[PDB]
From a paper:
Signalling initiated by antigen binding to B-cell receptor (BcR) immunoglobulins (IGs) is of paramount importance throughout the natural history of the disease. Recently, a cell-autonomous model of CLL cell activation was demonstrated whereby BcR IGs from both stereotyped and non-stereotyped CLL cases could promote Ca2+ influx and nuclear factor-κB target gene transcription without the addition of exogenous antigen. We demonstrate that BcR IGs derived from both indolent and aggressive CLL cases interact homotypically via their combining sites, binding to distinct internal epitopes in each subset of patients. These unexpected BcR–BcR interactions are sufficient to initiate intracellular Ca2+ influx, and mediate stronger affinities and long half-lives for the receptors derived from anergic B cells from indolent clinical cases, while weaker and short-lived for the aggressive ones.
Author numbering:
A (entry chain H): 1 to 139, 148 to 228
B (entry chain L): 0 to 220
């Protein structure tokens, strides 16, 4: 069974060149095309291009001017470069084994986008790393924590150091116009316990070494 | 020009143990000159890569459960699940490999669990004093554990309808109760925030006979 291993930098800034690579293990490097495909946030799949061991290529016409796909047969590896990136290029990128590269094998052999690597999430932004601010959402009652203005993903949120899990909803981050992310984590709790139970959200943002515990209680 | 692949429906509520089917239509014939019809079906889960399930219309990939089957011809195709299991939720794509470059995909069909209608519990949260003294106000409206997913949230500030200044986020369907939750965030400058009194979040949902409203008055509790 063909396995694919994928690596490359997923965080970059506008105008820079995206550079991803994949390595093939488990079967021959010959006989099929090796391809790149992407998936923009909350949208479908877009085939980018392909190459085979002999270096013949096919490219998506909408991207041909900015895409270069290359191969290195001695290591059984192939690569993608996408220049002048912009926000529109933001997506999860996958390398994948395509179709057989000759007509007779293409007609009878099962190959065709049947093996996929793990995806690399690509973000294209001018933003610099910034830890989040954590604000309370004061109070079946509901309460939570607003985790605002951080970069890049991800943050993690727990409640009472993991001891509270039931009824927790931690929402997907939205990317704000400032280019920074924001999210809320909420939990529903019995109103009768509000005065005798302590609720703390634990917020971690690794790139900025941010570790915040914010206690959330009723106001005045 | 690209071959346009059109899937329907966009979202399919399914019932465990019952059949499901989804449609894929191409803008022109997928019959290749070599006689094959290169139409593939994929399943994708959140956080995971696409997994090919069916190829050349009806060939089933190795290790793929036989409750999946593919059929159709020319420009009209169908993926069928004979008896839906919980792990079959996710997004399904079709893909044509007859005309290239480029290969092209459908825009996906979301498969989710059907359940009885459930109205959202609605909560509104005023900005914190901490946030306010930093020059910005975030007002948050929460819709908790509702179904179906469709819901409308409108912000009214002193009865003036807002638009362009809020953002929503929605959780994945709950694995245990099959509901969704939703948060809507209204963002205002501290200045604009203090120019008004009544902050209200109005929720429309199938489970609510009439729109439910939650509000607060700035500076009062």
């Amino acid at each position: 069974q063909v396995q694919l291993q994928q690596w490359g930098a997923g965080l970059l800034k506008p105008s820079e060149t995206l550079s991803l690579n994949c390595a093939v293990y488990g079967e021959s490097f010959s006989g099929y095309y090796w391809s790149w495909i992407r998936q923009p946030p909350g949208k479908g799949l877009e085939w980018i291009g392909e190459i085979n061991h002999s270096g013949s290529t096919n490219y998506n016409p909408s991207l041909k001017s900015r895409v270069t796909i290359s191969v290195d047969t001695s290591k059984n590896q192939f690569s993608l470069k996408l220049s002048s990136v912009t926000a529109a290029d933001a997506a999860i990128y996958y390398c994948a084994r395509g179709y057989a590269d000759t007509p007779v094998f293409r007609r009878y052999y099962y190959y065709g986008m049947d093996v996929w690597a793990k995806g690399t999430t690509v973000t294209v932004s001018s933003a610099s790393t910034k830890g989040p601010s954590v604000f309370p959402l004061a109070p079946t009652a509901a309460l939570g924590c607003l985790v605002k203005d951080y970069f890049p993903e991800p943050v993690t949120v727990s409640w009472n150091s993991g001891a509270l899990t039931s009824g927790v909803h931690t929402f997907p981050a939205v990317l704000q116009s400032s280019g920074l992310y924001s999210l809320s984590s909420v939990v529903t709790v019995p109103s009768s316990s509000l005065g005798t139970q302590t609720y703390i959200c634990n917020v971690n943002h690794k790139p900025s070494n941010t570790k915040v515990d914010k206690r959330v209680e009723p106001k005045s | 020009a690209d071959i346009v692949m059109t899937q329907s429906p966009l979202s399919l509520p399914v019932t465990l143990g019952q059949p499901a089917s989804i449609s894929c239509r191409s803008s022109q014939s997928l019959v290749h000159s070599d006689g094959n019809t290169y139409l593939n079906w994929f399943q994708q889960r959140p956080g995971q890569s696409p997994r090919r399930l069916i190829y050349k219309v009806s060939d089933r990939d190795s290790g793929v459960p036989d409750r999946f089957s593919g059929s159709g011809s020319g420009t009209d195709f169908t993926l069928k699940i004979s008896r839906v299991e919980a792990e079959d939720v996710g997004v399904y794509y079709c893909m044509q490999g007859t005309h290239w470059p480029p290969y092209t995909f459908g825009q996906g069909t979301k498969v989710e669990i059907k359940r009885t209608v459930a109205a959202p519990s609605v909560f509104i949260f005023p900005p914190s004093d901490e946030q306010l003294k930093s020059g910005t106000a975030s007002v948050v409206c929460l819709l908790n554990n509702f179904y179906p997913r469709e819901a409308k949230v409108q912000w009214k500030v002193d009865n003036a309808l807002q638009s362009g200044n809020s953002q929503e986020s929605v959780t994945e369907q709950d694995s245990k109760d099959s509901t969704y939750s939703l948060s809507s965030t209204l963002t205002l400058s501290k200045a604009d925030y203090e120019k008004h009194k009544v902050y209200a979040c109005e929720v429309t949902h199938q489970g609510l006979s009439s729109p439910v409203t939650k509000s607060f008055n700035r500076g009062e509790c």
